[PDB]
Each structure stands twice: as structure tokens, then as C-alpha cells.
């Protein structure tokens, strides 16, 4: 029982270290496998592109104080450190939306009150470090036991439906800028060529995915070719685009040189005191509240991601760490805030994709259903390699300018669609449309009436819709608290409506029950 | 045994009439089924488009002596009298490639020798009628019993593959006239890519609805009704999508206006058997027997092989087919329509197969293992008659038809070509080449035949198909029917020595589960 309160200071941290660190050389020996190369290549782009996008957005929102280079250099240096000293090396940490919202809100607050922004974030980082140390000392990561499977599949369907809505609203906007008229802002043949490239990439990678499980060719060649599906699709579509000469397509652009984005109003080291004018003393002690808010955000997303990754269905044997994963992340964020780099948190879709890009499926028997997961092939090399490649991507800035963005949209759609399977809420959504005589032989259909599982699904959908509506309004910083409020809902309100057997069968801690 | 020599004049024709005509009202009362409407709508376009294409080509190649108003009126009047009086009403008859090749060759010959073309074809038609009557009287259609499944699976494969090359060539050439440079019409932008988008959308919606028809979603009746109307739904959706766009130019379907000949200044509706302007030489009247023999061979091979493919034992056809009352009605409506200047017609293989398998009903299954089996076919005389009548009256309408782009129909044609491939064993044995020997299914011809002696059969069949294609693509392509005929002596002599009796019996067998 990893989530147990020992009753001694730093007990959980010591237990996690003793559990994980003995299996150290195994991680480096396990990496010798040609599936690791495919995983590295696939995850490199999925980690690089959000860095550029969110760096551009954050540079636009602020006065060009934090840009793209700083985000890349924070991502690389936190990823390397975490993969070297982390308990769970299958997690990919990076910038996300809620952090951007908090950053813009804090910038607005600082600008309104005539305060320093970069100097202001240093005290927030210090308070973050203090809170992390206090929580690890008096161990409180045992509260993750109360997060069930009702509050962790209302949050992984919303973080996968908010990433397929905006991977195709970044196409409905290359077709409003370059519109289809006749006789850059007005180029022809661009909006349709982008559609062609995106469709080609996502239909190729999902047929190589189907071909991986087919009966054609020898097994070893078939599996090797199926592993390299995304790289093959990317290379094919890049060559196809390169063949065309006159048509203009937007291409991936990275900054040049290792330097700050505002070399005339900023430096690499931020003074804790006033950089130009003295910092008010009252703000030093009043900076505790934003520290609490950002701590709550980071804690919820990292812990829920770790819970989703470490399910018993996915055959993970070495173990996960709920104590040596939050201290590291929060301490790194607090330290990076001193140099002006942004804070980082584990990414859910990227971590899930990285985890399920290394799974090995059982060699079946004609009867067998969806093959079962045999192993996961976990190691400390893929994440470290991805983080350094992202770090050194500035030096190779000429090879990356030959890759259009429209090709990567198909890969992003592939990621979003693939990450959906494996959660029971999607399956219960599927069961709504099928007639009651075609339902499968799972444990929550046989022991539960048909009209009382649809009610559970309807309530879960109502909660998800409320979460989305709250996120889309002018007060979106209360989203973590609304998500937290689902736990008392399950523990109080849903207990009265449903009987003990129905609740036990519907959301069980494990498979079968 | 329909293919048996009775020994009496017109015995086969009488037997076919007595077998088929009693079940006459059944055909008209079977048509009350919403799958028939979907079949009619699907086959209407598949019959209309080749008429326009081949009419344009033949008008180009014959100095506008036969156009697309003579191809839309031979296709519609010679197919309302094969479903009214035909033994097999699941056949769709229309113009094809070999007929076009023969027509251009005959036009060249007539132009070289200063002869009349339209007057020249009348005697060929008369000799065709005489040959058909002579062959039916002697009941010579029993020779179809010697065409196996080695010489009729080669044909199916070639025809579907040459219909999937021509759809791809139409696209390759919309991007050669309108190229991606950027700055009836030529050089327009956004056209070559929009055509690709429309074609891909139609094709993928067609397969999506085809797969949804067999899914477990929605009630069964609604699911099957929606799955039946897959092609019409895809066509309507893509037509609306194209109609939404305003400025981009796309080529659209065009039909002639009015019921009249294409050259009203050098042609009429009735061709005089004698000289139209100058007297016709007497020697040609008797020398026209050879082209009549050639066109008779072409029509006979096409129609009989199509009827053989349609009437397999696997597809649950119960009323019966006619090998005699379908070669006196096709080679004698043709023959006598050419005294009015209309072209000859023969049964179309892909269109007939599509029409046949668009009415099949698959069994309600149980659990995975084999693909559902055919339960029935739902054969009737109404769908073909309605399609022919609609093709005939497609001239008064056409303001509606000018709103339909060609790029949408290319996806439907590709769907037809891909779908028509399944059901023949040569494709399955081609699939078995790539799979390892431990994944072969439990069919009768894998269990009883060694692995390395079925690959040899497949290789020889591929060699024959490649030789057929090479001969078809050279400057002497009128010998293709004879090269196809030569496969029967090959199977009956050469392949007997190489393979043992058991291997030949299992490989090529008259019926599933030898
Ligand atoms: C491709 S990276 N384009 C994307 C733009 C934005 C996002 C994040 C969307 C988002 C989610 C949640 C919140 N508030 C939670 S308190 C705000 C936003 S915002 O629109 O950025 O402001 C993404 S992705 O979800 O990370 O894929 C992609
Ligand atoms: O094979 S098809 O009947 O689909 C066809 C389609 C098109 N374009 C879209 S309708 C164009 C031509 C054809 C017929 C191809 C063909 C097949 C055989 C022969 N010779 C046999 S002796 C000749 C042709 S041809 O039309 O290219 O001359």
C-alpha cells in the first residue's frame, strides 16, 4: 500500500526511494530495443510543438518578458533532472493552459498595482518550495486515496476533448486567413493543401496501426514496421510537401541562439529584492495566496496523471512514487522562478501517449479479444533523450524549418483519438446507442440494471458539462476547486441514490471487482 | 442442367421460356421493398456516366456521325426490351471499350476505301441477325460448359482492375490541365485540390456507411435502412458541400438538349439499306460477313461470361438464368437498331455485378468466424426497367444534372471497382501469397493442396493475365477475344500434365465445397 500514512516524518519519501532506487541499472539495460527509438522520435515532436505554441502565446500576453527560448530551456533542464532523479520516469512535464491563465492574471495584477512581475514571481516560488517541504515532511500525499475513478475519468475525457477541439480550430483558421476566392494573407492552394497533408498523415499512421495487427508478412518485420508508423507517415508527407514547388505552406520555426527574448529589459538572474526600484515588504508576505493556488493546480494535474498512468490494467511492476514526484517538481519550479523560467507540471495526454507507445501486446490465439497488455517496457532513457533533444533543438534550426505545421496536425489528431480508449466512461457512452441485447460481458453490465447505468453516465456527463462551462467563463481559475468538489459529491450525494452493490460494481478500484 | 443439348431445333429457347415465364407476376410484386429504390438511385448514375463519356469519344472518333444522343437512346430502348422480355433481368447492357475499338477500326477502313459508314453497318447488322438465328436454331450455346473458373476469374479481375485505372487517370489529368502554379477553362486555381477533396470525401463516407450497416448501433431496421442508402447519402452530402462553395470552378455533368441527331445536316433517323447518296457496291454486301463474325464473337464472350459470373451457386439465385433467351435478344436488337444508326450493345460486367450485389440480403449472424452468408438475392424486373427509363428521359431534365460535379462520381466509381473485387478466388489466392503459411484459412483448396503448388497455379494465372493485358495494350487489340478463348485449350491440355487430378479438382471446382 504505497498510499499509507506511516506516522513518521518523511516516511513516504524514504519508502519510495528504497522501493525504486535498487532497480537503477535495469532502466538503462532495458532501453536496448528498437521500439525505444520509435518512441523517442514520436514524442520529440509532441513535446517540441506545444513549447513553441505556448511560448509565442505567453510572449504575446506579457510584454515579451518570457518567450520561446526560456520555455524550451526550462522544459529541457526540468525534464533532464526529473528523468535522472525521478521515481516515475514515464511522465512528461511541460507548460499547459491553466498555468498560462494564471500567468496572464498575475501579469495583469502586477501591471495594475505598479509592481515588478519577474521579481514578484520569485517570492511565489519561495513559498511554493516552503509549502512542498511542509507537505512532504508532514506527509499528506495519502489524500490521493479519496480520488476514485469517477473523478479521474471526468478529468481525462475533458483534457482529451479540449485538445481535439483545438487541433481542429487551428485548421478552421488557415481557411479564414487564406480564404478560397481566385483571380502572407491571400495565397491560393494553401488551405486545401493543408487539409490534404493532414488527412494523409492521419490516414497513413492509423493503417500502419491496423497493419501492425494484421496477418501479413513475417511477425518480426510486421511488428518493426508497425512500431515506426508515425515516423514513416511524417517522412512520407514531408517528402510529398517538399516535392511541390510554388505553393506556400506555413512551416515550423524555432528561435536562433541561446539568449533571452528581451535582452534590453531583462537578464538571466533576477534579484530577489528590487531589480530597479525597491520591492514592497508587504507583497513578500502577501504572495502566499497565489503560491497556494499554483500549488493546488500543479498537485491536482500531477497526481491525477500519475493515478491514471499507474492503473493495474497497464502491467507496471517497478512501481510509482507519489512522494518523490511532487517535491521534485515543486522544488524545480521554485528554483527556476529565480532565473525567470516558467513553472512546469506533468502533461496528461503526452504522458499517456508515452506510456502506451511502449506497451507490448500478447501474441494471441484466433479466439482472443483485444489482446491483453503483456508488459510496458519502462526505462529512464527515452525521457532523458527527448528532453535533451528538445534542449538542443535550437542548434538544429534549419532541419526543422522544412516541416510544415499541417503535417503535425494529423499526428496530434492521432494522439487525441488514440488516448481515448482505456477509460470506462467512453465505453459507457458507447453503450448508450447500442440496443440492450448487444452489450458485452463486462462485470458492470451483468450485475447492474440497464436503466441505472445510463443514469450514472448521465450524471457524469452533467458534471463534465458543468466543468466545461465553468472553464469557458470569465472565472476559470476556480476549475481545480470545482474538480475537487466531485469527491464530496461521490462520498455523500451519490451514496443515497445508488445502493452499495451498484456503487461497488460501477466504479471499482480495479478490473473485475 | 440448363447447358444440355436436347437434340431438337430451338429446344433450349423453349426450355428457357417454359422455365422462366411462369414466374412473371412474382417479379413485379417482389419490387415493393425500400432497397429497390436505393438500387435504382445507385445504378442510375453508374449507367448514365459511361453513356456520356463513350458518346463523346465516339463522336470525336467518327466525325460526329454517332454522338451522345444516339448512345443515350440505344441504352434506353434496348434495355426496356430486355427487362420486359429477358430471361435474366439482373443484366445491365451498354457500350464498352472493345466495341469502340471495332467502331474506330471500321470507320478507318470505310474512309480508306471511299465507302459509306452508316450504310456499311446495316449489312453487318443483318449478318449478325442471321448468325444469331442460325446459332439459336442449332442450340450451339451449350459450348459454355467448357469455360471453367480459370477463364472466367481472369476476366473478372481484368475488368475491375481496368475500371480502377481509368478513375485514377481522370484525376491525374484534372491536375495536368489546372496545375498548382498560383497567381473548358484552363489554369484555374483551387480546382485540382477541391476535386481530390470531393472524391476522397465521397469514397470515405461510402465505406463508413457500408461498415455502419454491419455495426451494433441503433435499432436493426433503422440501421439497415440507413446502410442501404449509403451511396445516395454520400452523393447528396458532397453535392451540397460543393454547392456551398461559390467562387471555385469545378467541372459539372452535361447532357445534350433535345431529342435529335448530333449532325442534322449530314445524317437522318433512317438509313437506307442501299446507297444513301451513291450506290453501295454489291461485293461489300457479301464481304461484310467477317466483321459480323468478329463482333458476334465479342458480344457472345462478353455476355456469356457475365451471365456465368452472375449465376454462381454461391449467390442464392432460384428463379433461374437463360443462356439462350439472352443472345437472340442482345444480338438481334443490336443488329436491327443499326438501321436507324444506333450503336450495338452488350452486357456490362461491373455494372451487372454491382446491380446483382446491391440487392443481396445477408443472414442475421451469431458471433465472429465467417462473413455472414447470402440469404437471398431479391431478383425482379422493375429496377432495370426503371433505370433504363430514367436514362432515356434524362434529356428533358438536366438542369438538375448540371449541378453535379464529376469529381463526386469518381469516388462512387472507385467504390464500385473496389467492392466488385471480393467474391472471386483469384483475389483470395493473391492475398495468400503475402501471409505466412500458418495463417491460411480453413478453405477446401488449402487443406488438400500443398502450399508450393497453389502458388504455382496463382503464378501461371498471373502470367496469363499479364499476357492478356500486354496484348490488349499493343497495336493489335482486336485479337483479345481469341487470346481469351485460347485459355480453354490451355486448361484442357497443358495444365492437365503439370497437376494431378486431385489438385485440379480442388483448385478449379464448379462449386464451393468441392
Ligand atoms: C494547440 S497547442 N492549441 C492549444 C491552445 C490552447 C490549449 C489549452 C486550452 C485551455 C484549457 C484550459 C484552460 N483553463 C483551465 S483553468 C484554458 C485554455 S486556453 O484556451 O489556452 O487559454 C491547448 S491544449 O488543451 O493544451 O491542447 C492547445
Ligand atoms: O474499362 S472502362 O470501360 O471502365 C473505360 C473507362 C474509361 N474512362 C471512364 S468511362 C475509358 C476507357 C475505358 C475502356 C478501356 C479499354 C478496355 C479495353 C480495350 N480493348 C479491348 S479489345 C480498349 C479500351 S480504351 O477505351 O482505352 O480504348
Author numbering:
A (entry chain B): 673 to 855, 894 to 1223
B (entry chain A): 673 to 855, 893 to 1223
Paper text:
DIDS is a pan-inhibitor against the anion transporters from SLC4, SLC16, and SLC26A families and chloride channels. Uncertainty remains about the structural basis of the inhibition by DIDS since the electron density for DIDS in the crystal structure of AE1-DIDS is not well resolved, and thus we solved the cryo-EM structure of the human AE2 supplemented with DIDS (hAE2DIDS). The molecular models were thus built in the corresponding EM maps, respectively, using the crystal structure of human AE1 as the starting model. In the EM maps of hAE2 with HCO3− (hAE2NaHCO3) and DIDS (hAE2DIDS), the electron density for NTDs was not well solved, and thus only TMD structures were determined. The hAE2DIDS adapts into an outward-facing conformation, and the DIDS molecule lies in the middle of the outer vestibule with one of its isothiocyanato group forming the covalent bond with the ε-amino group of K842, a conserved residue corresponding to the KLIK in AE1. On the other end of DIDS, however, the “Lys-Ser-Thr-Pro” in the TM13 of AE1 is replaced by “Met-Ser-Thr-Ala” in the TM13 of hAE2. The cross-linking between DIDS and hAE2 tightly fixes the inhibitor molecule in the way of the substrates entering/exiting the outer vestibule and thus disrupts the pH-rebalancing capacity of AE2.
Here, we determine the cryo-EM structures of human AE2 in five major operating states and one transitional hybrid state. Among those states, the AE2 shows the inward-facing, outward-facing, and intermediate conformations, as well as the substrate-binding pockets at two sides of the cell membrane. In conclusion, given the presently revealed structural models, the AE2 uses NTD as the intracellular pH sensor to mediate the anion-exchanging activities of its TMD, thereby maintaining pH homeostasis.
